[PDB]
Design a protein around this nucleic acid. Sequence first.
RNA 1: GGCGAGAGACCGAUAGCGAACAAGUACAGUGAUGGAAAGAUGAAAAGAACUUUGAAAAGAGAGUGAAAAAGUACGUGAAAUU
RNA 2: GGAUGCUGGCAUAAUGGUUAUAUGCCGCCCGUCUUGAAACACGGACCAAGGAGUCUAACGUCUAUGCGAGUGUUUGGGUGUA
RNA 3: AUGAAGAGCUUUUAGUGGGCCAUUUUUGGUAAGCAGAACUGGCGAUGCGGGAUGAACCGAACGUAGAGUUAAGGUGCCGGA
RNA 4: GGGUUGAUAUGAUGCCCUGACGAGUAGGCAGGCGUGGAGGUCAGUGACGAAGCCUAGACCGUAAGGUCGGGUCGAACGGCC
Lengths: 52, 148, 185, 49, 127, 58, 125, 52
Amino acid sequence: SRPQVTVHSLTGEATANALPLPAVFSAPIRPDIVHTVFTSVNKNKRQAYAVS
Amino acid sequence: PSRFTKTRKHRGHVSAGKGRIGKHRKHPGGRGMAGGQHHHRINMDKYHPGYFGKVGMRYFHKQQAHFWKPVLNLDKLWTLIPEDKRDQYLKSASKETAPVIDTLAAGYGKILGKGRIPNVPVIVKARFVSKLAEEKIRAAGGVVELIA
Amino acid sequence: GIDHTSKQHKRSGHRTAPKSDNVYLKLLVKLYTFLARRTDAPFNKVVLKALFLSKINRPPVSVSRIARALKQEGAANKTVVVVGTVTDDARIFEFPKTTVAALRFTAGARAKIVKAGGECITLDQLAVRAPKGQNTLILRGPRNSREAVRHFGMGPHKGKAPRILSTGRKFERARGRRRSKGFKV
Amino acid sequence: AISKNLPILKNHFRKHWQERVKVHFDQAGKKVSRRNARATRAAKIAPRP
Amino acid sequence: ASLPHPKIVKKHTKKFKRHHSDRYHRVAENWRKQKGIDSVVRRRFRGNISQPKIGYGSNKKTKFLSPSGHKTFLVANVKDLETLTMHTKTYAAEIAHNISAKNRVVILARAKALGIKVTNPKGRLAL
Amino acid sequence: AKSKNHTAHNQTRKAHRNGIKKPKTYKYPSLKGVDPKFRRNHKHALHGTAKALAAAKK
Amino acid sequence: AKQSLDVSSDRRKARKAYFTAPSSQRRVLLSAPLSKELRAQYGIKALPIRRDDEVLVVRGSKKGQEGKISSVYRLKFAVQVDKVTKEKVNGASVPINLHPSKLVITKLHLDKDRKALIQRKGGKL
Amino acid sequence: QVWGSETVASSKVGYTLPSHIISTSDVTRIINSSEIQSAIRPAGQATQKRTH
RNA sequence: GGCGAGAGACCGAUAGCGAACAAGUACAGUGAUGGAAAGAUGAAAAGAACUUUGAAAAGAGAGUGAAAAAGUACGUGAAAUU
RNA sequence: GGAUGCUGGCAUAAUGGUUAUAUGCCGCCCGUCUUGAAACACGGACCAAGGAGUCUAACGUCUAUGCGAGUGUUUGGGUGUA
RNA sequence: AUGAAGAGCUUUUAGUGGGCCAUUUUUGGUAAGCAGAACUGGCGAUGCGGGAUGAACCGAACGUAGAGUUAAGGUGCCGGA
RNA sequence: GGGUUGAUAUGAUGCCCUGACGAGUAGGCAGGCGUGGAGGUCAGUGACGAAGCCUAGACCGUAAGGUCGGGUCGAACGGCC
């Protein structure tokens, strides 16, 4: 009983073709986890700075 | 990190949480495990007893592949069988179709009796077993057959 | 002045409003504290505290443990409640049909229960079915099964598991541990 | 030094290890160069596996 | 134009000055606690400066208020001001210091039109 | 460079800060030190008693 | 955006490249556009510049002003133009440095080489 | 096809989408549903009367 | 290390290589060796014509400049001290 | 189960604040080791700028998070907007 | 009997490990503002009023203000009475 | 220690009621102020003057500190998570 999703065209307005929701959007929504994981995964692109 | 830190909260306070009398100096008790038969002896006898001395027999050139003998108890002994056929066998707990288990191919070397498998026959292949494990198996109606 | 017979401005020593920043857990806490405040129910208050509890004061509960509980008398058609997580245990082969309510369910345990014909339930569904703890049964898991509780309280003549990385011969099986090398503890 | 209940530790840093440290910052570029080499070798022995 | 507030008591109008802020130029008035061991200021001897503490704190009903009875709120633009539209009787506007004179003129006309108070309505006026 | 050698000063204060709690007392205390003869026979007796009560309320 | 590896995105390197650029690279940097007339008449957007081109200034306080080149001071990254001068209180005159990014051309000074360059860049003459 | 759903598998090995511990987020709807309200006692006026 | 390329949650002229400059320089020491300080006018020198006081330096005017509260003792120009 | 009513004057530097000074009373120089510092115990002529519990390996308790009798993608490979 | 201001339980970690004073008991010593112990309270780690002055004495222990009453100490004047 | 999801309106870590308490070196814990740089947002301020500097001029906060006005100057800079 996924509600539906209407598709739009490239020319704008809309179409009759429609879809379900893939049930990943029914997943929980945790900004604490997003925050931790983001801190680390954004740490992971880093070059080494250092002194002589 | 560095901003959730009691250093940052000590700033302004004089001794940085180390004291005025006691004076955080370098190595006042020694370095490392120094003084275990001396001024650190209480600690070594109260928290880490057995530290001083030798006990047994030296084994030159020891190999933890001669000593590879992982254990499996009868408690599990179906974890090795998938869930796809488990209930099939367990309800057709019968003869002439008995499930065969290669503990060795699974990663085990010995079989033990931690308890109470069902009353279904099984065929178990293994290098070693315990007396009690096997008694339980063949009481269930199964058997052991050894391998290398 | 005052000659105090106590300590002043001391905290209760009891956790309110956990420091888990999990918003769904906080929703559950809002719910169950409403219910504790109004439904005059010790079960609601118990659940509220157990929701405040930490990871290790929230151990897991094995379905085999649940099965022992349902093997009690008068407790078969009851509703089990676990504030924590429920783990599978393939050391058993049968299982009854009951319903279980809890925060988390290992996929294996969920499968086991569903296969036995029950339903795995959240605490909000529980709050709509049995607000005052109608026909429930709370379970808590072991706490002293922990490999830090081995070392807790380490001294002579306690039998209490030193803190040690490597095991075997010549790692603390000597002086202090036998009467040949001086003394046994 | 020896103090409260804490396991005995064996941390072998009594030498100039900070003259001898290797830090594989090149995990990635070294993977990439391995790949380029595989590709060039294959193009050199083109039909071969 | 403000709201009924009680009478405002501050409990210390005089500024807490660092000890020897007057004696040595290297010691600035930014308050700073004597953590010493023989400091008569830390010991609260009579005739020394009064150290801050939470009893000097203000009444919640009058806290953050200006003499007008308004709370100050900084604006850089008509948008930040339109946010204050419906709270004129409690909140007043401070045009920021980095604003240009023409934008100040705009903001002032808009605040007049909307009935909003402005506590720096003379920045960068010539005449 | 001498010193103070011993003193009992302040120790009562510390004790009674976190102090003189009676250890505690339980039902069914320990049998450590008791005559092993008595222990042995008590074991056999409790076994018999449990057997009997179980068969009774069976 | 950048998609190669032999291309620098660093202010430091580009700046020291520009400043230690030698006189040939400086020619190519001192290139200047053409007016609408010459752009349509030759088929080209812009071009290097030299000592006897005719030119029009369209940015600055000497906006709007025409003349002929008198010197190309590549060391200073500039162009010194007759009829565009400053009158010094000692009754004197000085040429005023400009930039060929702001200049625009009205009339060239042609040769075998400029003509070949145009035919290279795809012009019609 | 990639994050999965209730009925198909995700194509990420050993991965099942994370599970909700609460059936929804409208705790107010829960509170006001019917049965809570049946078992609930009545309430005070949200601002106790200053006595003495 | 050498040669050539690219980058950075790095330092930003008491920092970062000792060295952003005519730095392994001036300079010291018999010698081995030691080893600095020092960046910024302004968009552009347009870097102050001319008059006057003065032995001159400079000053006062003038004038350039958007600005001399930018005058090579030059971006701003804190404090101590005056 | 917490003060309202009546009236007057001013509506401004009058109240009030800031500040300097005067007056009354109090007020020893800070930092430090010290049982004890105003000390006839030490450091401090003054100002600026710099300036001291960091990083790592392996660990203990504790707390969060994920999975859960399993857990750990990231030696490596595949792939890539690299 | 009185009180209970909640009772029990665990983990972990800092600083400390130079001490000094008074009452009373007390040891050596001619004695000491000496040395060494005991119980309690204090200073250290603590300002306030009083003791002219003082680490410890007496009184009293401290959020910011107001009003009232006192403590110890005092009431010729300095200095409130 | 309690009360309060109830609908319309704002903040549930919120609001509100009641009672008690507030000394402090070493030391611990907590909540915060501020600096350099990073990801994000304010379609943020800005040559009609950014930052910086001066200001017994004003305002907020117990305070760290923050804001504003006037002057100087000339090219970049802040609020919040």
